Amino acid sequence: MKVAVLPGDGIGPEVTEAALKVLRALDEAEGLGLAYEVFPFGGAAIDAFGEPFPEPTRKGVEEAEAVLLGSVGGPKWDGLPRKIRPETGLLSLRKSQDLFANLRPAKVFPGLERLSPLKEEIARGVDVLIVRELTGGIYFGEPRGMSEAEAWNTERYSKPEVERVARVAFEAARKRRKHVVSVDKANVLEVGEFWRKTVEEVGRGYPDVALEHQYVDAMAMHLVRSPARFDVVVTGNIFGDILSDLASVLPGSLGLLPSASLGRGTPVFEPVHGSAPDIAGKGIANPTAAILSAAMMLEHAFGLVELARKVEDAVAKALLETPPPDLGGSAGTEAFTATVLRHLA
Amino acid sequence: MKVAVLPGDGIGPEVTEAALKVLRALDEAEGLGLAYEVFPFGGAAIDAFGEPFPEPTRKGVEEAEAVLLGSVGGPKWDGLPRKIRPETGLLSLRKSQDLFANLRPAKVFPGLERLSPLKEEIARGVDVLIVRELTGGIYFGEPRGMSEAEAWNTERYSKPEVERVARVAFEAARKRRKHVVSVDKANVLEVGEFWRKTVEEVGRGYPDVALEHQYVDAMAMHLVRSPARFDVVVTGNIFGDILSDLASVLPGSLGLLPSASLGRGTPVFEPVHGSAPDIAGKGIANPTAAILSAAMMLEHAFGLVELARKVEDAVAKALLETPPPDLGGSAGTEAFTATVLRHLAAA
Numbered sequence A: 001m002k003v004a005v006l007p008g009d010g011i012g013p014e015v016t017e018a019a020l021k022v023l024r025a026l027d028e029a030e031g032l033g034l035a036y037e038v039f040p041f042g043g044a045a046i047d048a049f050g051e052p053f054p055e056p057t058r059k060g061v062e063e064a065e066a067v068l069l070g071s072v073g074g075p076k077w078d079g080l081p082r083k084i085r086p087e088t089g090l091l092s093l094r095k096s097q098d099l100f101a102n103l104r105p106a107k108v109f110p111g112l113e114r115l116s117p118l119k120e121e122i123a124r125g126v127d128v129l130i131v132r133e134l135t136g137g138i139y140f141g142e143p144r145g146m147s148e149a150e151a152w153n154t155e156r157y158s159k160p161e162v163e164r165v166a167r168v169a170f171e172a173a174r175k176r177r178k179h180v181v182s183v184d185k186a187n188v189l190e191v192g193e194f195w196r197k198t199v200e201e202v203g204r205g206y207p208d209v210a211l212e213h214q215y216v217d218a219m220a221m222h223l224v225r226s227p228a229r230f231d232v233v234v235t236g237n238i239f240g241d242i243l244s245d246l247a248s249v250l251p252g253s254l255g256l257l258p259s260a261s262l263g264r265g266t267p268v269f270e271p272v273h274g275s276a277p278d279i280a281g282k283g284i285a286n287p288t289a290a291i292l293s294a295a296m297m298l299e300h301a302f303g304l305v306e307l308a309r310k311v312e313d314a315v316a317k318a319l320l321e322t323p324p325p326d327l328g329g330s331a332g333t334e335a336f337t338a339t340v341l342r343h344l345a
Numbered sequence B: 001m002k003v004a005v006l007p008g009d010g011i012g013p014e015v016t017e018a019a020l021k022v023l024r025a026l027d028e029a030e031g032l033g034l035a036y037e038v039f040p041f042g043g044a045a046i047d048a049f050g051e052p053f054p055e056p057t058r059k060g061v062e063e064a065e066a067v068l069l070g071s072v073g074g075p076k077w078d079g080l081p082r083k084i085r086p087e088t089g090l091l092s093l094r095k096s097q098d099l100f101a102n103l104r105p106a107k108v109f110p111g112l113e114r115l116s117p118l119k120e121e122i123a124r125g126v127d128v129l130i131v132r133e134l135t136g137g138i139y140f141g142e143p144r145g146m147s148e149a150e151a152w153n154t155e156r157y158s159k160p161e162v163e164r165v166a167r168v169a170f171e172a173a174r175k176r177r178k179h180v181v182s183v184d185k186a187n188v189l190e191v192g193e194f195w196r197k198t199v200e201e202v203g204r205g206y207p208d209v210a211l212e213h214q215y216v217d218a219m220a221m222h223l224v225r226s227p228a229r230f231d232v233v234v235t236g237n238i239f240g241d242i243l244s245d246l247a248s249v250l251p252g253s254l255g256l257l258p259s260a261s262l263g264r265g266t267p268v269f270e271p272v273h274g275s276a277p278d279i280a281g282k283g284i285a286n287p288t289a290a291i292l293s294a295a296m297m298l299e300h301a302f303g304l305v306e307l308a309r310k311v312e313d314a315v316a317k318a319l320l321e322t323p324p325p326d327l328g329g330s331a332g333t334e335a336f337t338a339t340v341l342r343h344l345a346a347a
């Protein structure tokens, strides 16, 4: 278990640090052989190096089996140009690992149905992993262009793009509740048939996971009326962008959400949440998304499923016992992380 | 006020009759000079003519100032060649009147928040109209195809396409709450920027209408967290499809939703629901969607906003006071329409 930790900026460190405190408490109980190192990335790297993703960190990432990253970015580094922006170093990190699937779970923890915009009866039990294809389709598709008379973008997909992103979904499914919904617009678009056919074909390799198909329009409906029946959702770039933003608001507290990016290189595990300098330092930031990222890490990077689950659970009971300020409660980073610990036995 | 009435299949004719009862009650109270003919269309046309959209219906539609339409389709017809399919008829109707805008409002009636998938606080007051471009975008774009190695599709919009759908949204906002949110994907896509520039440019002619832009993915988060803050919403074919289908489930009863298609010729108004051949002629079909379509017809076809609001309010009280069986009630078709009429008695 060798991890590269890039804490980044603002609440970046505090939370990421909270998550290592969990990781250290786990390696100690379970005997993981956890061996991590901290590398400068983003604002921190720009200040010390002049670039947000300098060579000593690119190297540190490759030599690790997982990347635990906190958030990057700040108002200090905004009066800066393209080439060296923390947002750009973030795009370089992903590109250097060839991360092609964004995995983002939107779970409703028991006792937290009150936070959901959905009625308690609907928000109860929701735990859906949205797997979004990150490098193809309309966003990178070509031909593309603009003129006084018209504009055009091209939703293009190739067979391997659909394939690898499909395997990611199946691998994940096997780990949770064993079901894959693939989403497309096959009843009108050729890309959809292409998509669906290709997925079905990857399915022949996984007779173990059930496979359902839905049109992006229908899925936007199912995700509001019955999100609780979905396990794993796989789809293209734009639809994945939409569907995962849709799914992200079902737990009704965005600062709680973890995120991963799988690919050919070192996977990356990060909180979906921003840097938040407003509260950076202060020991109040909610370390939940980070501890959960670390948990997605153990699961997607090192396959310790059962273990990622005790982490998640430990976080669930913590959210309920002594809630962080964003949940109306009054527990800070040190207070909360100590709670997650007591419940990790 | 000349209306061509296409009852269609299943419940279409029963719920269309109900809507006419409201129209007749109003013609009477206010002399609208209402006049209407009924024409065959959908399955009922295929049965008597061999095609879903026959010449006299085609001609009738061409002459009327609005079309009131029921639902079309059903088991008896679901496998035919495309040339004589109900869907094709429906598609022939819109093409013959060059209808490019699909209007689909999603209103949560006061007191029916309990139907909403959302918590009450969030559902209260939801009343959003989604204006979906319908003849362009990716669904019809060139180029297109699939090999065994790659497939392609193009999200294409020309300036006049985006202009005309904006105008509709703007005029529609003038009768509502004077706020339009134009939805694109301007931060990653060329089509997005084009769409924004174009819409913004058009907005210069509706300076009385508050305008706002949203990315499609942020809009999907907004429609769940605060759909109550939007009035009219305008976007392209695919996003519209996704955003209206998303809006569509907010109120919790799909059978109540009306629909309108606007363009160059005769706008057409219809329920969103299917023909439900199941409960056809049992006296139970909920005529709400059909009554609300008649209301949309009073508003986008005839400019009778005030009148359209009285139909909606009457309908609203009917839904709390005597709900149909799909709302847990027992008020069959005739009984519900009579409640709406009896409420419109407070003229």
Ligand SMILES: [Mn+2]
Pocket: none
């Ligand atoms: Mn070293």
Ligand SMILES: [Mn+2]
Pocket: A241, A242, A245, B217, B218
């Ligand atoms: Mn997004």
Ligand SMILES: [Mn+2]
Pocket: A217, A218, B241, B242, B245
């Ligand atoms: Mn649809």
